[PDB]
Design a binder for this molecule. Structure first.
Ligand SMILES: [Mg+2]
Ligand SMILES: [Mg+2]
Ligand SMILES: [Mg+2]
Ligand SMILES: [Mg+2]
Ligand SMILES: [Mg+2]
Ligand SMILES: [Mg+2]
Ligand SMILES: [Mg+2]
Ligand SMILES: [Mg+2]
Ligand SMILES: [Mg+2]
Ligand SMILES: [Mg+2]
Ligand SMILES: [Mg+2]
Ligand SMILES: [Mg+2]
Ligand SMILES: [Mg+2]
Ligand SMILES: [Mg+2]
Ligand SMILES: [Mg+2]
Ligand SMILES: [Mg+2]
Ligand SMILES: [Mg+2]
Ligand SMILES: [Mg+2]
Ligand SMILES: [Mg+2]
Ligand SMILES: [Mg+2]
Ligand SMILES: [Mg+2]
Ligand SMILES: [Mg+2]
Ligand SMILES: [Mg+2]
Ligand SMILES: [Mg+2]
Ligand SMILES: [Mg+2]
Ligand SMILES: [Mg+2]
Ligand SMILES: [Mg+2]
Ligand SMILES: [Mg+2]
Ligand SMILES: [Mg+2]
Ligand SMILES: [Mg+2]
Ligand SMILES: [Mg+2]
Ligand SMILES: [Mg+2]
Ligand SMILES: [Mg+2]
Ligand SMILES: [Mg+2]
Ligand SMILES: [Mg+2]
Ligand SMILES: [Mg+2]
Ligand SMILES: [Mg+2]
Ligand SMILES: [Mg+2]
Ligand SMILES: [Mg+2]
Ligand SMILES: [Mg+2]
Ligand SMILES: [Mg+2]
Ligand SMILES: [Mg+2]
Ligand SMILES: [Mg+2]
Ligand SMILES: [Mg+2]
Ligand SMILES: [Mg+2]
Ligand SMILES: [Mg+2]
Ligand SMILES: [Mg+2]
Ligand SMILES: [Mg+2]
Ligand SMILES: [Mg+2]
Ligand SMILES: [Mg+2]
Ligand SMILES: [Mg+2]
Ligand SMILES: [Mg+2]
Ligand SMILES: [Mg+2]
Ligand SMILES: [Mg+2]
Ligand SMILES: [Mg+2]
Ligand SMILES: [Mg+2]
Ligand SMILES: [Mg+2]
Ligand SMILES: [Mg+2]
Ligand SMILES: [Mg+2]
Ligand SMILES: [Mg+2]
Ligand SMILES: [Mg+2]
Ligand SMILES: [Mg+2]
Ligand SMILES: [Mg+2]
Ligand SMILES: [Mg+2]
Ligand SMILES: [Mg+2]
Ligand SMILES: [Mg+2]
Ligand SMILES: [Mg+2]
Ligand SMILES: [Mg+2]
Ligand SMILES: [Mg+2]
Ligand SMILES: [Mg+2]
Ligand SMILES: [Mg+2]
Ligand SMILES: [Mg+2]
Ligand SMILES: [Mg+2]
Ligand SMILES: [Mg+2]
Ligand SMILES: [Mg+2]
Ligand SMILES: [Mg+2]
Ligand SMILES: [Mg+2]
Ligand SMILES: [Mg+2]
Ligand SMILES: [Mg+2]
Ligand SMILES: [Mg+2]
Ligand SMILES: [Mg+2]
Ligand SMILES: [Mg+2]
Ligand SMILES: [Mg+2]
Ligand SMILES: [Mg+2]
Ligand SMILES: [Mg+2]
Ligand SMILES: [Mg+2]
Ligand SMILES: [Mg+2]
Ligand SMILES: [Mg+2]
Ligand SMILES: [Mg+2]
Ligand SMILES: [Mg+2]
Ligand SMILES: [Mg+2]
Ligand SMILES: [Mg+2]
Ligand SMILES: [Mg+2]
Ligand SMILES: [Mg+2]
Ligand SMILES: [Mg+2]
Ligand SMILES: [Mg+2]
Ligand SMILES: [Mg+2]
Ligand SMILES: [Mg+2]
Ligand SMILES: [Mg+2]
Ligand SMILES: [Mg+2]
Ligand SMILES: [Mg+2]
Ligand SMILES: [Mg+2]
Ligand SMILES: [Mg+2]
Ligand SMILES: [Mg+2]
Ligand SMILES: [Mg+2]
Ligand SMILES: [Mg+2]
Ligand SMILES: [Mg+2]
Ligand SMILES: [Mg+2]
Ligand SMILES: [Mg+2]
Ligand SMILES: [Mg+2]
Ligand SMILES: [Mg+2]
Ligand SMILES: [Mg+2]
Ligand SMILES: [Mg+2]
Ligand SMILES: [Mg+2]
Ligand SMILES: [Mg+2]
Ligand SMILES: [Mg+2]
Ligand SMILES: [Mg+2]
Ligand SMILES: [Mg+2]
Ligand SMILES: [Mg+2]
Ligand SMILES: [Mg+2]
Ligand SMILES: [Mg+2]
Ligand SMILES: [Mg+2]
Ligand SMILES: [Mg+2]
Ligand SMILES: [Mg+2]
Ligand SMILES: [Mg+2]
Ligand SMILES: [Mg+2]
Ligand SMILES: [Mg+2]
Ligand SMILES: [Mg+2]
Ligand SMILES: [Mg+2]
Ligand SMILES: [Mg+2]
Ligand SMILES: [Mg+2]
Ligand SMILES: [Mg+2]
Ligand SMILES: [Mg+2]
Ligand SMILES: [Mg+2]
Ligand SMILES: [Mg+2]
Ligand SMILES: [Mg+2]
Ligand SMILES: [Mg+2]
Ligand SMILES: [Mg+2]
Ligand SMILES: [Mg+2]
Ligand SMILES: [Mg+2]
Ligand SMILES: [Mg+2]
Ligand SMILES: [Mg+2]
Ligand SMILES: [Mg+2]
Ligand SMILES: [Mg+2]
Ligand SMILES: [Mg+2]
Ligand SMILES: [Mg+2]
Ligand SMILES: [Mg+2]
Ligand SMILES: [Mg+2]
Ligand SMILES: [Mg+2]
Ligand SMILES: [Mg+2]
Ligand SMILES: [Mg+2]
Ligand SMILES: [Mg+2]
Ligand SMILES: [Mg+2]
Ligand SMILES: [Mg+2]
Ligand SMILES: [Mg+2]
Ligand SMILES: [Mg+2]
Ligand SMILES: [Mg+2]
Ligand SMILES: [Mg+2]
Ligand SMILES: [Mg+2]
Ligand SMILES: [Mg+2]
Ligand SMILES: [Mg+2]
Ligand SMILES: [Mg+2]
Ligand SMILES: [Mg+2]
Ligand SMILES: [Mg+2]
Ligand SMILES: [Mg+2]
Ligand SMILES: [Mg+2]
Ligand SMILES: [Mg+2]
Ligand SMILES: [Mg+2]
Ligand SMILES: [Mg+2]
Ligand SMILES: [Mg+2]
Ligand SMILES: [Mg+2]
Ligand SMILES: [Mg+2]
Ligand SMILES: [Mg+2]
Ligand SMILES: [Mg+2]
Ligand SMILES: [Mg+2]
Ligand SMILES: [Mg+2]
Ligand SMILES: [Mg+2]
Ligand SMILES: [Mg+2]
Ligand SMILES: [Mg+2]
Ligand SMILES: [Mg+2]
Ligand SMILES: [Mg+2]
Ligand SMILES: [Mg+2]
Ligand SMILES: [Mg+2]
Ligand SMILES: [Mg+2]
Ligand SMILES: [Mg+2]
Ligand SMILES: [Mg+2]
Ligand SMILES: [Mg+2]
Ligand SMILES: [Mg+2]
Ligand SMILES: [Mg+2]
Ligand SMILES: [Mg+2]
Ligand SMILES: [Mg+2]
Ligand SMILES: [Mg+2]
Ligand SMILES: [Mg+2]
Ligand SMILES: [Mg+2]
Ligand SMILES: [Mg+2]
Ligand SMILES: [Mg+2]
Ligand SMILES: [Mg+2]
Ligand SMILES: [Mg+2]
Ligand SMILES: [Mg+2]
Ligand SMILES: [Mg+2]
Ligand SMILES: [Mg+2]
Ligand SMILES: [Mg+2]
Ligand SMILES: [Mg+2]
Ligand SMILES: [Mg+2]
Ligand SMILES: [Mg+2]
Ligand SMILES: [Mg+2]
Ligand SMILES: [Mg+2]
Ligand SMILES: [Mg+2]
Ligand SMILES: [Mg+2]
Ligand SMILES: [Mg+2]
Ligand SMILES: [Mg+2]
Ligand SMILES: [Mg+2]
Ligand SMILES: [Mg+2]
Ligand SMILES: [Mg+2]
Ligand SMILES: [Mg+2]
Ligand SMILES: [Mg+2]
Ligand SMILES: [Mg+2]
Ligand SMILES: [Mg+2]
Ligand SMILES: [Mg+2]
Ligand SMILES: [Mg+2]
Ligand SMILES: [Mg+2]
Ligand SMILES: [Mg+2]
Ligand SMILES: [Mg+2]
Ligand SMILES: [Mg+2]
Ligand SMILES: [Mg+2]
Ligand SMILES: [Mg+2]
Ligand SMILES: [Mg+2]
Ligand SMILES: [Mg+2]
Ligand SMILES: [Mg+2]
Ligand SMILES: [Mg+2]
Ligand SMILES: [Mg+2]
Ligand SMILES: [Mg+2]
Ligand SMILES: [Mg+2]
Ligand SMILES: [Mg+2]
Ligand SMILES: [Mg+2]
Ligand SMILES: [Mg+2]
Ligand SMILES: [Mg+2]
Ligand SMILES: [Mg+2]
Ligand SMILES: [Mg+2]
Ligand SMILES: [Mg+2]
Ligand SMILES: [Mg+2]
Ligand SMILES: [Mg+2]
Ligand SMILES: [Mg+2]
Ligand SMILES: [Mg+2]
Ligand SMILES: [Mg+2]
Ligand SMILES: [Mg+2]
Ligand SMILES: [Mg+2]
Ligand SMILES: [Mg+2]
Ligand SMILES: [Mg+2]
Ligand SMILES: [Mg+2]
Ligand SMILES: [Mg+2]
Ligand SMILES: [Mg+2]
Ligand SMILES: [Mg+2]
Ligand SMILES: [Mg+2]
Ligand SMILES: [Mg+2]
Ligand SMILES: [Mg+2]
Ligand SMILES: [Mg+2]
Ligand SMILES: [Mg+2]
Ligand SMILES: [Mg+2]
Ligand SMILES: [Mg+2]
Lengths: 146, 97
RNA sequence: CGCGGGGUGGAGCAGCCUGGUAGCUCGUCGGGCUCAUAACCCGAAGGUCGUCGGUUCAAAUCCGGCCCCCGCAACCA
RNA sequence: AAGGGGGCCUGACUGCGAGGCCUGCAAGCCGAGCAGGGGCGAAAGCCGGGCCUAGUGAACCGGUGGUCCCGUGUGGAAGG
RNA sequence: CUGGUGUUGGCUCUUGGUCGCGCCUGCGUAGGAUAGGUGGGAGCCUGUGAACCCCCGCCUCCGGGUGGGGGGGAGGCGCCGGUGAAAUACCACCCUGGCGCGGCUGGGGGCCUAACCCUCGGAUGGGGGGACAGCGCUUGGCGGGCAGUUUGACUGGGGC
RNA sequence: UUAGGCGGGACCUAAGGUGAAGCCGAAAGGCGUAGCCGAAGGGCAGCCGGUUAAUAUUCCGGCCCUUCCCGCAGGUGCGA
RNA sequence: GGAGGCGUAGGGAAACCGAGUCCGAACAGGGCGUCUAGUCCGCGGCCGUGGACCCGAAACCGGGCGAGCUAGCCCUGGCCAGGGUGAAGCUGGGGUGAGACCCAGUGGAGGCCCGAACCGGUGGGGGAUGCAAACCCCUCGGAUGAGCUGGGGCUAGGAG
RNA sequence: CCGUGGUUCGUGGAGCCAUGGGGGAAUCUGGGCGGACCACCGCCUAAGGCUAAGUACUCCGGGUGACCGAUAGCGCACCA
RNA sequence: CGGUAGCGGGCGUGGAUCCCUGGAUGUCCGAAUGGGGGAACCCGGCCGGCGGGAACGCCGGUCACCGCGCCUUUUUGCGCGGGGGGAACCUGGGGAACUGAAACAUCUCAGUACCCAGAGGAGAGGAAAGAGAAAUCGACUCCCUGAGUAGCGGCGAGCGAAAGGGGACCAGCCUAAACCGUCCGGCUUGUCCGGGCGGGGUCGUGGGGCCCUCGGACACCGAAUCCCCAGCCUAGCCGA
C-alpha cells in the first residue's frame, strides 16, 4: 500500500514521499523500524503542515532578506580610520564592518555571513558580498577613509 | 480456529456435495449427487503481533481484517495507555472498534 | 458425440517442422567367403507414398472433404 | 404365383380413418374409404414397403433438425 | 499426497510466453549468385564521402548473405534483360524464423530477515529454520482405517 | 459409646484430582503452571493394672510423657 | 360477517378461439365437448393422510449412567511353613615360562525341585425346582515369580 | 469469483437473502432490487440500534363438562 | 392450645384461636461466594465482644469470582451489575436414525428428537437497499383465504410457497457522518492529527451540513418516561 518515508531510503524514495510498497514490506519491516509510517488520510494531512509551514518560513526568510538587498545595494558605508597615504592597518574586519553598520545606519548584520578574507589593509573603495540567505546575493559598498 | 477478534468471524457448517456426470448446461443428462455431508469452514485466522504504547500486543484475526488491526494502532496513538498491562491495552483497542 | 496423429516396398520405417531425394533395417533373389552355420561383403527385383478434389515451376512434405487403424477424454435415459 | 426375367419408377407417401380381430390394463393386428401430391398401366385398376406369422423395449432423463406456441414490468436473450 | 491462492517480505542471476517497434532471415536445376511472397518499378543511390582495400561484428547449405569501424575524393546500380515459371536496382505490406530494445505477464537457481516456526533458566533480545513449513479457502488423487447399503426370481427343499 | 498420648483432622507429600496464569475448542467443554486437595506411605507425646449389667491405651490407681501461652534465669547474631 | 369456495363452457401444450374447439391445405374425416343442475348441512358405506383394528420383534439413532464385577496400567503397603539340589564367586592345593584348566573346602545362584498357606481349576463322582444363577468331595497345576494380595487412582460403548 | 446455507427451487435458464475463501469500489451524476444477461421503464436506500398491542404456553388460581368413578381417572383420591 | 384421643397444664368480650397485609426471627447445605470438601461437615485471616483469658473456645461483623464504570495515583480504593432455578411456551448455536421410498445411495423422516447458550411473562419480528406489475401497496406479528394453487421432485416417494383479498392489532423512534464547541494526549509545532464529552443530524417527495433571504421561535403536537386518581387482586359483610 501507500506509505511515507520517515528517512531517506535509496532506490525507494527520499524522506517525505508517498510511495507504494507491498503491504508485508511495510508491516514487518519499514513501519516497525521507524523507517516509514502509514499514508493514512490523517498522516497525509499532518505531513502537509510541515510542507506548508517549512516552505512558508523559507519563502519568508528569502523575502526577509530582500528588505536588506534593496537598501544595501543602494547605499555606501563610509569607515574613517587614522591613516597614511594608502596604509595604516586596523581591526577593520567584518566585526568592525557590522559595528560600524549598526551605529551608522542602525541595521545589524552577521559578521560571519559577510564575505571577507582578511581585515582591510589599505584605504580604498571596497565591494563586499553579504550572503544572509543562500539564494540572495548582496553587493556591499564600503569605503575606508581618513 | 476460533473467533476473529476484530470481525467476530467464526467457523460455520457447510456441506460437501459430491456430484457426477455431465451438466445439462453442456448438453449432458445432468449432474447426479453421490453424497452430501457436513464439514466446517474456518476463518483464515492469523496472528498479528504489534506494539502499542511500547508494550507488545498480539491479535488473532482473520486475514481479511489484518489491516484493521493496524488501523487501531494508528487510532490509539491519541491515547493515555502507559503502565497498562498488555491485556488492559488490548481490551481498550478493541473498544475503539 | 468432442479432440490428438498415422497410413510410405512383403513386415516394422526416419523422411514430414524446413516444397527439389519413394531412403533405412529386417525379408526374398543372385554372386563372394565358408567344416559348415551364422555373421561379414558386392549387386538386385520390389510403392498410386489411403483416397478424391485443390495452392504450386514441382510437392509422401501444404491445404478441403472422405476412407480406415490406433490413440485421448467425456457421456450413456 | 407369393416363384424366374425385364421396362419404367420411390406409395419404404402426407393429412385422416367407417368398421372389426385380439385383449385385465397397456400394448399388438387387419382395414375399406376421403383429401393432397405422385408411380406404373391403353384400361379396369394396383401402390400408405417386403407371401404371411420372429427380427424387439413403456415412461423418465438428455441430444439433433424444424416450428415460432409460452418466456416472470416492456423488447430481446436464457429456458421451455 | 497434491496444484492454485491468503498469511507472504527484501536483493539478484537466469529463462519462456504473448504484443509492439527496429533489423536480418530465404541457397534444387537456370543462373552474373543465396531470387521468400506479392504490389508500386523506370528510374534511381549519389563530393549527403562512391569503387578496387584494412581492422573486425555475427550467420553460412563453406559459394559468402549481412554489417559497426580505418584510408578514401568519384564512381558503383538496375532499367536494358540473358539463363527463368518468377528479375535482379529503390520502395511498401506480408510470410518462415532469429535477434535487439519496450510493455503485460509465467517458469527456474542463489543470497537475505523481518511475518511464521523452533530454542535460549536471561526475552522490545540472542541463536536455528525461514517466506519454505504450519494454518485458511479451493483443485484433483490414493483411500475397508471407517460408514451406509446392494448382492434377483423360477426351482418336486435350498445350493450347484 | 467419656481420650492432649489410640485412629483421623487443625502436619507432609504419591499416583491421581483440582486449578488464578496461560493455551485450545461452534456451545457444553479440553489441556494446564503456581497454588490447593489427595494415604493403609512419611511425621508425632502412654504403659501396667483396677472398675461397669453394658465403655475403657478414653473412667480410676500407680509410674511416664507432648505441644502451646506468660513470666523468669542463663545462653546466642536472632531471623524463612 | 360474501373475503372466499363449488356451480352456470368447453377445446387446446399454448397463443387462442368458443357451442364449439383440436389435428389439418381442407368447405374430408376423426377426438374431446354442446343438447342445462347444482350446491349446503346431517347420517351411512368405503377410500387418502395421520400409530389408523389390537398386542409382538431382532435392530438403528440421540443424550446420559457405569471399571465397588471383570481387563490393563499408575501410586503405596502386605504375604510366600518346612525340606531338597548346590551355579558363580572366594580360599587353598595341583599344573605351566606365565596360562588355560583340575581337585577340595567354603559359598548360597535359579521365570530350579518336593510341598502348606496363598493363587489356580486337570480327571472322576455327587449336585441339576441345588447348600450354590457354577457349588461339594476325592484327585490334580503353580507355589522367589512373567508370583499372590490390600488400600488409593486412570482408561468405556464402534469405545476401552 | 470460489465453497455453501435459506426459499416452493434437489445445479436448474438460478435471480433474491445469507457468507467460510480470494479480488476489491463509489458518497446521489452514488449505489441495491423487479428470477441468467443486456437495454428500457420503474421500486428501494445496504454495510448502526430500540419499540407496545394483536400471538404462544399453563407450575399456579377460578369456572364449566351427553369427562372417569378406585383394574377407571394423573404413576399417586390413602403418609407416592 | 394443628392432624390427636390420652396424661399434664393454660388462654378468650381487657375481643383469644382463625383469615388477610406489612414486619421480625430464620441453625447447616445448596448459585453457595474466606478456604477445603465425600452437599448438610472440616479449617482459617482481619476487626470487635464474651469467659480468669495470653494460650483455648464461643459470639457479631467481614473476606469468592467475572463484567462494566476504569469514576480507579496501574498499586489501592469505590460503584452498579452478573452467577442459580422455573411446568410448558420462545429465540439462537449444533443436530440424528428408525421409517417412507413396498430393496436403496439422491430424496424422505426433519431442521424433527435430542444436546448447548440465552430471553421473559412472553420471546421472536418490526419501521423497506420491501413487495412485484398495479402507472399498485406502504413496519412487524397473528387468524381465515389465496392453495394442496404456483412451483419443487431418482419429475419417484413425496414436498409445498408468495402476492392479493377478508380480519386481530395498530406506532413509531434513536443514532453514525458533515459541521460548530470543549477537554486530555501527540511531537512531522499545528487553518494539524488522535481520543472523550456537548451541540448539530436522521434521509427516498432523497435527506442533512455549511453561507444568503421570509417565516415562526409564546402557535402546535407530545410520550413507550415520571406523578396522581378510578378501577382491579390479595381478608370479608348483608342477604326474602
Ligand atoms: Mg530501495
Ligand atoms: Mg504513489
Ligand atoms: Mg501557522
Ligand atoms: Mg479463538
Ligand atoms: Mg453456520
Ligand atoms: Mg448451517
Ligand atoms: Mg438432478
Ligand atoms: Mg503476522
Ligand atoms: Mg516495559
Ligand atoms: Mg507480546
Ligand atoms: Mg490484505
Ligand atoms: Mg483482500
Ligand atoms: Mg482509556
Ligand atoms: Mg517401429
Ligand atoms: Mg412375379
Ligand atoms: Mg423364368
Ligand atoms: Mg428360374
Ligand atoms: Mg423376380
Ligand atoms: Mg435380378
Ligand atoms: Mg421390376
Ligand atoms: Mg414407361
Ligand atoms: Mg420408411
Ligand atoms: Mg357407424
Ligand atoms: Mg362415426
Ligand atoms: Mg384393448
Ligand atoms: Mg409384435
Ligand atoms: Mg392415380
Ligand atoms: Mg398394359
Ligand atoms: Mg395414364
Ligand atoms: Mg406396399
Ligand atoms: Mg423378404
Ligand atoms: Mg421380413
Ligand atoms: Mg424385448
Ligand atoms: Mg424414475
Ligand atoms: Mg428433447
Ligand atoms: Mg423433454
Ligand atoms: Mg414471442
Ligand atoms: Mg418475452
Ligand atoms: Mg422480459
Ligand atoms: Mg422474447
Ligand atoms: Mg426450442
Ligand atoms: Mg492443499
Ligand atoms: Mg496449498
Ligand atoms: Mg508474496
Ligand atoms: Mg504462498
Ligand atoms: Mg527469485
Ligand atoms: Mg538478467
Ligand atoms: Mg521475463
Ligand atoms: Mg506503444
Ligand atoms: Mg523479397
Ligand atoms: Mg590495400
Ligand atoms: Mg590480411
Ligand atoms: Mg561465426
Ligand atoms: Mg569471402
Ligand atoms: Mg564478413
Ligand atoms: Mg567507413
Ligand atoms: Mg582514425
Ligand atoms: Mg542488355
Ligand atoms: Mg532475349
Ligand atoms: Mg536479386
Ligand atoms: Mg519509391
Ligand atoms: Mg512471419
Ligand atoms: Mg511484470
Ligand atoms: Mg519461480
Ligand atoms: Mg528446480
Ligand atoms: Mg538461508
Ligand atoms: Mg530468525
Ligand atoms: Mg538466518
Ligand atoms: Mg522480533
Ligand atoms: Mg533465568
Ligand atoms: Mg529454561
Ligand atoms: Mg525469539
Ligand atoms: Mg530483552
Ligand atoms: Mg531470532
Ligand atoms: Mg506457505
Ligand atoms: Mg494405491
Ligand atoms: Mg471402497
Ligand atoms: Mg439390487
Ligand atoms: Mg451383508
Ligand atoms: Mg414341480
Ligand atoms: Mg439354482
Ligand atoms: Mg498405635
Ligand atoms: Mg477412625
Ligand atoms: Mg502433583
Ligand atoms: Mg482439569
Ligand atoms: Mg498440580
Ligand atoms: Mg480462569
Ligand atoms: Mg483462561
Ligand atoms: Mg464439538
Ligand atoms: Mg477455560
Ligand atoms: Mg496436573
Ligand atoms: Mg511442574
Ligand atoms: Mg508444589
Ligand atoms: Mg502445602
Ligand atoms: Mg499447606
Ligand atoms: Mg481430591
Ligand atoms: Mg495437605
Ligand atoms: Mg491432606
Ligand atoms: Mg496418614
Ligand atoms: Mg500413618
Ligand atoms: Mg506430624
Ligand atoms: Mg503409641
Ligand atoms: Mg473388661
Ligand atoms: Mg490395659
Ligand atoms: Mg376454502
Ligand atoms: Mg402473449
Ligand atoms: Mg383459435
Ligand atoms: Mg354445437
Ligand atoms: Mg387451420
Ligand atoms: Mg374436406
Ligand atoms: Mg371439421
Ligand atoms: Mg369412431
Ligand atoms: Mg367435431
Ligand atoms: Mg359428439
Ligand atoms: Mg341445448
Ligand atoms: Mg344429442
Ligand atoms: Mg347436461
Ligand atoms: Mg362420507
Ligand atoms: Mg398417499
Ligand atoms: Mg405402530
Ligand atoms: Mg382407518
Ligand atoms: Mg384411513
Ligand atoms: Mg443406520
Ligand atoms: Mg450397528
Ligand atoms: Mg461417567
Ligand atoms: Mg475395578
Ligand atoms: Mg497394609
Ligand atoms: Mg522374603
Ligand atoms: Mg522353599
Ligand atoms: Mg537328601
Ligand atoms: Mg539348604
Ligand atoms: Mg562344582
Ligand atoms: Mg576374598
Ligand atoms: Mg584370585
Ligand atoms: Mg583354603
Ligand atoms: Mg590337590
Ligand atoms: Mg596355585
Ligand atoms: Mg609350557
Ligand atoms: Mg561370597
Ligand atoms: Mg565351588
Ligand atoms: Mg536354594
Ligand atoms: Mg514345578
Ligand atoms: Mg475355588
Ligand atoms: Mg484322575
Ligand atoms: Mg460332576
Ligand atoms: Mg456328573
Ligand atoms: Mg438346573
Ligand atoms: Mg494320584
Ligand atoms: Mg500336590
Ligand atoms: Mg497344590
Ligand atoms: Mg509334578
Ligand atoms: Mg502391588
Ligand atoms: Mg485398584
Ligand atoms: Mg456400542
Ligand atoms: Mg472413530
Ligand atoms: Mg469414541
Ligand atoms: Mg475395541
Ligand atoms: Mg454464492
Ligand atoms: Mg445461512
Ligand atoms: Mg438450498
Ligand atoms: Mg420454511
Ligand atoms: Mg440454492
Ligand atoms: Mg428445473
Ligand atoms: Mg436459487
Ligand atoms: Mg442480479
Ligand atoms: Mg451468503
Ligand atoms: Mg466473502
Ligand atoms: Mg460507484
Ligand atoms: Mg470524494
Ligand atoms: Mg437514484
Ligand atoms: Mg423488488
Ligand atoms: Mg426481469
Ligand atoms: Mg447484472
Ligand atoms: Mg423495491
Ligand atoms: Mg437502518
Ligand atoms: Mg420486542
Ligand atoms: Mg388451573
Ligand atoms: Mg381448574
Ligand atoms: Mg359414570
Ligand atoms: Mg382400588
Ligand atoms: Mg368399588
Ligand atoms: Mg379394592
Ligand atoms: Mg387393582
Ligand atoms: Mg397431578
Ligand atoms: Mg391425605
Ligand atoms: Mg403420600
Ligand atoms: Mg407425587
Ligand atoms: Mg405426597
Ligand atoms: Mg396427618
Ligand atoms: Mg390433643
Ligand atoms: Mg399433637
Ligand atoms: Mg397421656
Ligand atoms: Mg387431665
Ligand atoms: Mg377489633
Ligand atoms: Mg429453610
Ligand atoms: Mg466451596
Ligand atoms: Mg462475599
Ligand atoms: Mg475438610
Ligand atoms: Mg493462622
Ligand atoms: Mg470468621
Ligand atoms: Mg486520577
Ligand atoms: Mg490502570
Ligand atoms: Mg486497573
Ligand atoms: Mg450507588
Ligand atoms: Mg438475569
Ligand atoms: Mg440461567
Ligand atoms: Mg446467531
Ligand atoms: Mg434448535
Ligand atoms: Mg452459542
Ligand atoms: Mg435414512
Ligand atoms: Mg408410506
Ligand atoms: Mg423402505
Ligand atoms: Mg418396505
Ligand atoms: Mg416417517
Ligand atoms: Mg439449525
Ligand atoms: Mg421447514
Ligand atoms: Mg418443536
Ligand atoms: Mg401484563
Ligand atoms: Mg408481545
Ligand atoms: Mg400479553
Ligand atoms: Mg415482545
Ligand atoms: Mg427487536
Ligand atoms: Mg432489529
Ligand atoms: Mg417508506
Ligand atoms: Mg415478478
Ligand atoms: Mg390496482
Ligand atoms: Mg396495469
Ligand atoms: Mg387501478
Ligand atoms: Mg405510478
Ligand atoms: Mg420431498
Ligand atoms: Mg420442496
Ligand atoms: Mg422437507
Ligand atoms: Mg426440499
Ligand atoms: Mg413454507
Ligand atoms: Mg418469490
Ligand atoms: Mg397473505
Ligand atoms: Mg367483509
Ligand atoms: Mg391484511
Ligand atoms: Mg381478539
Ligand atoms: Mg401502521
Ligand atoms: Mg448526540
Ligand atoms: Mg463513529
Ligand atoms: Mg503550537
Ligand atoms: Mg502553531
Ligand atoms: Mg458528561
Ligand atoms: Mg458525538
Ligand atoms: Mg458529538
Ligand atoms: Mg436530536
Ligand atoms: Mg422513489
Ligand atoms: Mg442535495
Ligand atoms: Mg443542502
Ligand atoms: Mg434580505
Ligand atoms: Mg425573504
Ligand atoms: Mg406567518
Ligand atoms: Mg394558544
Ligand atoms: Mg399518560
Ligand atoms: Mg384480601
Ligand atoms: Mg368478593
Ligand atoms: Mg347470613
Ligand atoms: Mg336465609
Amino acid at each position: 500500500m501507500k506509505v511515507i518515508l520517515l528517512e531517506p531510503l535509496e532506490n525507494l524514495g527520499d524522506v517525505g514521499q508517498v510511495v507504494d510498497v507491498k503491504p508485508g514490506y511495510a508491516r514487518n519491516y519499514l513501519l516497525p523500524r521507524g523507517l516509514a509510517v502509514l499514508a493514512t488520510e490523517s498522516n497525509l494531512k499532518a505531513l502537509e503542515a510541515r510542507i506548508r509551514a517549512q516552505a512558508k518560513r523559507l519563502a519568508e526568510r528569502k523575502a526577509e532578506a530582500e528588505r536588506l538587498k534593496e537598501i544595501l545595494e543602494n547605499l555606501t558605508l563610509t569607515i574613517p580610520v587614522r591613516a597614511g597615504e594608502t596604509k595604516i592597518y586596523g581591526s577593520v574586519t567584518a566585526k568592525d564592518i557590522a559595528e560600524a553598520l549598526s551605529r551608522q545606519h542602525g541595521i545589524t548584520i552577521d559578521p560571519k555571513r559577510l564575505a571577507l578574507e582578511k581585515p582591510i589593509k589599505e584605504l580604498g573603495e571596497y565591494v563586499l558580498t553579504y550572503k544572509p540567505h543562500p539564494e540572495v546575493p548582496i553587493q556591499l559598498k564600503v569605503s575606508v577613509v581618513a | 480456529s476460533k473467533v476473529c477478534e476484530i470481525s467476530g468471524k467464526r467457523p460455520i457448517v457447510a456441506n460437501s456435495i459430491q456430484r457426477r456426470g455431465k451438466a445439462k448446461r453442456e448438453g449432458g443428462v445432468g449432474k447426479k449427487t453421490t453424497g452430501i455431508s457436513k464439514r466446517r469452514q474456518y476463518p483464515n485466522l492469523q496472528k498479528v503481533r504489534v506494539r502499542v504504547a511500547g508494550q507488545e500486543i498480539t491479535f488473532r484475526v482473520a486475514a481479511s481484517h489484518i489491516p484493521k488491526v493496524y488501523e487501531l494502532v494508528e487510532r490509539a496513538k491519541g491515547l493515555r495507555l502507559e503502565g497498562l498491562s498488555p491485556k488492559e491495552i488490548k481490551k481498550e483497542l478493541l473498544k475503539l472498534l
